[PDB]
């Protein structure tokens, strides 16, 4: 049986947009209900979205697990400030439930280093984001360090992201941007996240087995 997303697209349901609600462990194809925000209730480009749609179309197994527990994986940073009026819920501010927007604890964003090794018996889909403040004043209020960077690397993926501080058009009340990235982890591989700021870490991943 297919996947009937009620009021979200793929990007809305996979990122954990707070508007999506309600358990599928297999689906032939996806029924994506459109939305204005394009799934991204926080403005930003989704890198290789069609590539991820195409490989989410037909899966035979689909487990969702907490790759990085919120209450224990981020001790030197603040994992509780990352909510926005752009992604609301129940009247208050919220955020994607499968990501965590990390922010400096105190007045310091110490270098972040976290690794996950695929202990599963199938591929693991990992989603993260890169935030770009509108002004450098926001950068220091969020990440303390002005020369921040993000490094994401596995055995088949490697990229260094740099903050792109620019005043963009006011979309969804926000002139900052937040790009979204993904990659698949082979059953024996390790993915690593290095950051001195601007990283929206994964909180939930997905272990899946696809068809054709």
């Amino acid at each position, epitope marked *: 049986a297919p996947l009937h997303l009620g009021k979200c697209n793929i990007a809305g349901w996979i990122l954990g947009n707070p508007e999506c609600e309600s358990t599928a462990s297999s689906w032939s194809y996806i029924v994506e209900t459109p939305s204005s925000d394009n799934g991204t209730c926080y403005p930003g480009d989704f890198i290789d979205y069609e590539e991820l749609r195409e490989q989410l179309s037909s899966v035979s197994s689909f487990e969702r697990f907490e790759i990085f527990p919120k209450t224990s994986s981020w001790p030197n940073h603040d994992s509780d400030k990352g909510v926005t*009026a752009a992604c*609301p819920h129940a009247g*208050a501010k919220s955020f994607y439930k499968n990501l965590i927007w990390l922010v400096k604890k105190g007045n310091s964003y110490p270098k972040l280093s976290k690794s996950y090794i695929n202990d599963k018996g199938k591929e693991v889909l990992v989603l993260w984001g890169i935030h770009h403040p*509108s*002004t450098s004043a926001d950068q220091q209020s*969020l990440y303390q360090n002005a020369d921040a960077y993000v490094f994401v690397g596995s055995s088949r993926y490697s990229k260094t992201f740099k903050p792109e501080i620019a005043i963009r058009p006011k979309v969804r*009340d*926000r002139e900052g941007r937040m790009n979204y990235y993904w990659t698949l982890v082979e059953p024996g591989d390790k993915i690593t996240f290095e950051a001195t700021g601007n990283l929206v870490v994964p909180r939930y991943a997905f272990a899946m087995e696809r068809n054709a």
Partner: antibody, heavy 114, light 111 residues
Framework: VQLVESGGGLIQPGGSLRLSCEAS????????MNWVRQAPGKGLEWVSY????????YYADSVKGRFTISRDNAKNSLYLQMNSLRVEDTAVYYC????????WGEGWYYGMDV | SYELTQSPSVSVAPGRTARITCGGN??????VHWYQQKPGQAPVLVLY???HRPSGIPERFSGSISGDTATLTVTRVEADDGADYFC?????????????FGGGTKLTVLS
């Protein structure tokens, strides 16, 4: 942590005074400051606000063009220059600091700590 | 021009729960902050950003956002808790950045 204010008293209408708000036991240069008044028996009313850098300075409508915010981080003191005072300006004037600085582009506001 | 509506008086008995409400258009998206002012004393921040509780504030103080209505909840209410409570938001969607308070809710403890 403590904020000591003074400089207030009795002014005749059209007159002026300067309030001061000195800081102790915290790094006054990294916190964003505020002035809030309270009529003799009424409620709280925000007067004005300034960042730690002295960059952003906002005022309430009823005091624009009459009150000016200033701060000297070199002396841990915040100022309110009140010109063209009126009878409805009679109130208790509090200074207060925000927990964490306001994240404007992200819409993050924190309360007033001390 | 934006207005935070707030009830003026609430009366509770010793030991019960008192709920002070603060109404405003999109109050949760802005972040509502609560202050406790005792007679003759300066205000005391008891809640910021809707739910977050400052240090030294007892866990008896909590906050919820039910859409356009914010609520300060005080459990095991005692005579020391009797004071005036004000809510606060920042508003950038009604002109220049300006701060708005509520009228204040006097909590009488009936002790």
């Amino acid at each position: 942590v403590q904020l000591v204010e003074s400089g207030g008293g009795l002014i005749q209408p059209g007159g002026s005074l300067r309030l001061s708000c000195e800081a102790s036991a915290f790094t006054f240069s990294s916190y964003e400051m505020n002035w809030v008044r309270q009529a003799p028996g009424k409620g709280l009313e925000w007067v004005s606000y300034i960042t730690s850098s002295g960059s952003r300075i906002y005022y309430a409508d009823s005091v624009k063009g009459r009150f000016t915010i200033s701060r000297d981080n070199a002396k841990n003191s915040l100022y309110l220059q009140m010109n063209s005072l009126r009878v409805e300006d009679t109130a208790v004037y509090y200074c207060a600091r925000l927990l964490d600085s306001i994240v404007w582009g992200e819409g993050w506001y924190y309360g007033m700590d001390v | 021009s934006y207005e935070l509506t707030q009830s003026p008086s609430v009366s509770v008995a010793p030991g019960r729960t008192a709920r002070i409400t603060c109404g405003g258009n999109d109050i949760g998206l802005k972040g509502v902050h609560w202050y406790q002012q005792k007679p003759g004393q300066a205000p005391v921040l008891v809640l910021y950003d809707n739910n977050h509780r400052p240090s030294g504030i007892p866990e008896r103080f909590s906050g919820s956002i039910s859409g356009d209505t914010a609520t300060l909840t005080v459990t095991r209410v005692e005579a020391d808790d009797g004071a005036d409570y004000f809510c606060q938001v920042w508003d950038t969607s009604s002109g220049p950045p300006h701060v708005i308070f509520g009228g204040g809710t006097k909590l009488t403890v009936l002790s």
